[PDB]
Amino acid sequence: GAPPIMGSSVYITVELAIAVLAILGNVLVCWAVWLNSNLQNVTNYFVVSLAAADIAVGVLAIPFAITISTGFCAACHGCLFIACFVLVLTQSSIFSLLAIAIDRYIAIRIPLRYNGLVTGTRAKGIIAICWVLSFAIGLTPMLGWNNCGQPKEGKNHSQGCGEGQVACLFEDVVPMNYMVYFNFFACVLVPLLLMLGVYLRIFLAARRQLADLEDNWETLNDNLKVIEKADNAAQVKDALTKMRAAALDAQKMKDFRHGFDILVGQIDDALKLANEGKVKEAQAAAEQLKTTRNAYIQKYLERARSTLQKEVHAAKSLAIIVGLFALCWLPLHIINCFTFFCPDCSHAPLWLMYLAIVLSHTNSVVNPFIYAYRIREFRQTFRKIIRSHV
Numbered sequence: 514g515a516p517p518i519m520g521s522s523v524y525i526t527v528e529l530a531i532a533v534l535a536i537l538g539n540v541l542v543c544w545a546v547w548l549n550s551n552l553q554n555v556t557n558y559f560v561v562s563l564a565a566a567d568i569a570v571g572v573l574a575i576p577f578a579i580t581i582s583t584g585f586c587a588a589c590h591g592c593l594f595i596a597c598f599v600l601v602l603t604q605s606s607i608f609s610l611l612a613i614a615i616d617r618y619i620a621i622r623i624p625l626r627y628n629g630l631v632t633g634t635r636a637k638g639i640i641a642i643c644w645v646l647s648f649a650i651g652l653t654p655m656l657g658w659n660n661c662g663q664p665k666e667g668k669n670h671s672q673g674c675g676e677g678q679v680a681c682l683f684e685d686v687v688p689m690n691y692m693v694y695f696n697f698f699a700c701v702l703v704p705l706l707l708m709l710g711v712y713l714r715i716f717l718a719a720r721r722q723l724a725d726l727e728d729n730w731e732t733l734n735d736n737l738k739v740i741e742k743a744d745n746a747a748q749v750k751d752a753l754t755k756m757r758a759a760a761l762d763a764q765k766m767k768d769f770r771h772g773f774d775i776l777v778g779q780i781d782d783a784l785k786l787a788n789e790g791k792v793k794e795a796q797a798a799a800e801q802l803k804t805t806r807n808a809y810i811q812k813y814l815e816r817a818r819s820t821l822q823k824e825v826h827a828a829k830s831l832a833i834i835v836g837l838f839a840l841c842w843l844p845l846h847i848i849n850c851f852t853f854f855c856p857d858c859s860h861a862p863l864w865l866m867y868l869a870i871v872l873s874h875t876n877s878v879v880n881p882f883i884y885a886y887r888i889r890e891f892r893q894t895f896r897k898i899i900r901s902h903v
């Protein structure tokens with residue numbers, strides 16, 4: 514086989530390239546949120562926590578990955594810290610992605626309660642708790658779920674390690690049952706399936722809200738046509754009963770309120786005429802509603818639709834981030850499943866292990882590109898920072 518330094522040189526060069534780009538792009542994200550008060554909202558506090566975890570991949574996890582590739586002699590607990598630190602950063606990423614999804618689900622489900630429920634102060638406390646939990650989950654092997662008690666004595670003596678020392682190789686110190694059942698199934702796949710569930714629920718909520726606005730609108734217009742081609746008070750009365758219910762529903766901001774006030778008032782004016790049997794006076798009064806609709810109600814309808822469409826576009830952008838996380842991490846998890854569940858299978862070759870490691874690290878480069886492409890407020894801020902400060 515080719516001298517191992519040759520494959521190592523390629524691996525290390527690739528890891529350093531990824532580290533440089535992870536740091537630069539994620540620093541830009543943080544700098545943008547810092548500069549632009551329009552980016553300073555609770556959603557973007559989780560974006561910043563996620564960017565911090567990605568900067569720590571370039572600054573720490575990649576140098577650790579380079580180190581552990583050598584199989585250097587180390588105290589087994591020092592070795593575990595180097596092997597497991599990236600699991601803390603990845604767990605922190607999962608908590609941030611889950612928080613973003615739930616945040617967007619609260620914003621679309623109860624918009625009026627959002628600002629008083631989801632505050633900056635609460636977000637900061639959740640981020641701190643999530644970072645503590647990420648340390649506890651990713652460094653669980655350091656608590657004694659590890660192979661330090663069953664060292665590879667042949668590798669230890671071949672590499673010349675001292676006493677209490679092991680050849681520091683990931684799959685010699687970190688148990689595969691930890692990596693498959695605890696890390697992958699419980700701590701990554703369950704949260705990814707939950708996020709999939711939350712985004713589903715966001716898109717279902719948006720679609721139901723957009724459908725309800727269109728139905729209210731159509732109830733308005735159809736009942737207007739019922740009233741026109743009507744032939745007695747009872748008919749005009751029944752339609753105006755529908756319209757009034759529909760109009761109070763659409764209502765649920767001074768220029769807005771004046772609109773629904775006029776409309777409801779006109780509906781009651783025409784209701785009083787109908788109840789008095791005055792059918793043509795009722796119909797004339799109902800014809801008035803058309804100018805209230807054209808001048809106020811169509812404006813509110815188009816603004817509510819535009820807000821919901823923006824929320825759908827934003828939820829697609831954030832879900833793409835989750836999909837790219839899944840694409841970059843699953844290969845390594847799936848290889849661990851083959852290693853663990855298929856002892857009769859040939860182990861994935863080294864070149865494939867290193868490709869899957871590098872792919873996982875590339876995930877710390879991509880988020881700044883998704884933001885620049887998909888989110889106008891980020892792209893415009895990145896442009897200002899690059900033109901001005903470079």
Ligand SMILES: CC(C)CCC[C@@H](C)CCC[C@@H](C)CCC[C@@H](C)CCCC(=O)OC[C@@H](O)[C@@H](O)CO
Nearest residue numbers: 529532533571572573575576577580585586587595
């Ligand atoms: C990547 C780049 C674009 C930016 C990096 C920024 C800076 C701050 C990186 C900092 C790197 C350090 C944290 C690296 C730590 C390296 C440690 C883990 C190396 C350990 C090697 C060691 O212990 O020596 C080996 C022998 O001592 C052993 O065989 C005997 O005990």
Ligand SMILES: CC(C)CCC[C@@H](C)CCC[C@@H](C)CCC[C@@H](C)CCCC(=O)OC[C@@H](O)[C@@H](O)CO
Nearest residue numbers: 517520521523524527582863864867868871872875
């Ligand atoms: C995010 C996505 C949209 C795009 C991601 C792009 C991905 C595929 C990264 C591309 C990099 C590769 C084309 C090149 C990497 C080649 C590396 C993995 C070769 C390593 C060879 C190897 O096995 O060396 C290690 C061993 O020889 C041993 O010495 C221990 O280091």
Ligand SMILES: CC(C)CCC[C@@H](C)[C@H]1CC[C@H]2[C@@H]3CC=C4C[C@@H](O)CC[C@]4(C)[C@H]3CC[C@]12C
Nearest residue numbers: 573577586587588589590591592593594595678
């Ligand atoms: C602020 C940032 C830069 C601090 C980074 C400190 C890092 C590099 C320190 C903290 C704990 C350290 C480890 C502690 C113990 C051991 C076991 C020893 O047998 C080999 C070195 C090794 C594996 C150390 C490597 C360096 C290490 C990982």
Ligand SMILES: CC(C)CCC[C@@H](C)[C@H]1CC[C@H]2[C@@H]3CC=C4C[C@@H](O)CC[C@]4(C)[C@H]3CC[C@]12C
Nearest residue numbers: 839840843844845847848851858859860861862
């Ligand atoms: C999430 C997307 C990108 C799917 C990627 C699936 C990857 C991880 C799959 C596709 C084919 C798979 C390989 C197919 C066959 C073998 C041979 C066996 O002896 C060890 C596992 C190994 C080497 C598998 C590892 C995982 C593998 C590389």
Ligand SMILES: CC(C)CCC[C@@H](C)[C@H]1CC[C@H]2[C@@H]3CC=C4C[C@@H](O)CC[C@]4(C)[C@H]3CC[C@]12C
Nearest residue numbers: 702843846847848850851852853854855856858
């Ligand atoms: C993509 C998300 C939603 C699901 C993840 C699917 C994972 C857990 C699946 C996909 C392919 C599966 C593997 C397919 C084939 C084998 C070989 C068998 O001898 C042991 C089980 C094993 C190794 C499976 C383990 C679980 C596995 C890796």
Ligand SMILES: Nc1nc(NCCc2ccc(O)cc2)nc2nc(-c3ccco3)nn12
Nearest residue numbers: 682683684692696845846849863866867870
């Ligand atoms: N299985 C595994 N191996 C390694 N590194 C060692 C690659 C290797 C595997 C076998 C061998 O004999 C020599 C080297 N890093 C690893 N990182 C992860 C990981 C992180 C998150 C999910 O899986 N899994 N993983």
Ligand SMILES: CCCCCCCCCCCCCCCCCC
Nearest residue numbers: 517518521522523525526529582583
């Ligand atoms: C991109 C800047 C320069 C890139 C670094 C060059 C890579 C050469 C370093 C080789 C060191 C190898 C150490 C031992 C590896 C053996 C692992 C089995």
Ligand SMILES: CCCCCCCCCCCCCCCCCC
Nearest residue numbers: 640641644645648649652653655656
């Ligand atoms: C918002 C600021 C981020 C806060 C980060 C602080 C994290 C401190 C370290 C966590 C301590 C947990 C210890 C559990 C693992 C012990 C294994 C040796």
Ligand SMILES: CCCCCCCCCCCCCCCCCC
Nearest residue numbers: 833836837839840879882883886887
């Ligand atoms: C296993 C599910 C993975 C599916 C991937 C979803 C991503 C879709 C990509 C379309 C939109 C991408 C926007 C910009 C792409 C830049 C990539 C660096």
Ligand SMILES: CCCCCCCCCCCCCCC
Nearest residue numbers: 527528530531534875878879882
């Ligand atoms: C070896 C380093 C790998 C980093 C690859 C990251 C890809 C990010 C997407 C860039 C797309 C830019 C297209 C511009 C037209």
Ligand SMILES: CCCCCCCCCCCCCCC
Nearest residue numbers: 572573576577579580583585586
């Ligand atoms: C402010 C952080 C700068 C840290 C630079 C650390 C460089 C680490 C070199 C490791 C040498 C290990 C060689 C073993 C003999």
Ligand SMILES: CCCCCCCCCCCCCCC
Nearest residue numbers: 638641642643645646649650653
């Ligand atoms: C900054 C406030 C401290 C946060 C306290 C974390 C509470 C931990 C509760 C149970 C821990 C379960 C860890 C799973 C391994």
Ligand SMILES: CCCCCCCCCCCCCCC
Nearest residue numbers: 590645646648649650655656657
């Ligand atoms: C054999 C070395 C083990 C070191 C573990 C000592 C620290 C206690 C762990 C407390 C974790 C609390 C985190 C909050 C859930």
Ligand SMILES: CCCCCCCCCCCCCCC
Nearest residue numbers: 698702706850853854855856857
């Ligand atoms: C989302 C699917 C998760 C389920 C994957 C579980 C696979 C268990 C594999 C058992 C293999 C047993 C091998 C014995 C020879």
Ligand SMILES: CCCCCCCCCCCCCCC
Nearest residue numbers: 844859860861862865868869872
């Ligand atoms: C990084 C994940 C995608 C990798 C796709 C490559 C598939 C080739 C697998 C062949 C390896 C077979 C070796 C076993 C003897």
Ligand SMILES: CCCCCCCCCCCCC
Nearest residue numbers: 558561562565569637640644
């Ligand atoms: C705007 C409030 C968000 C604060 C998030 C900062 C996260 C920093 C954690 C650093 C841990 C790296 C090891």
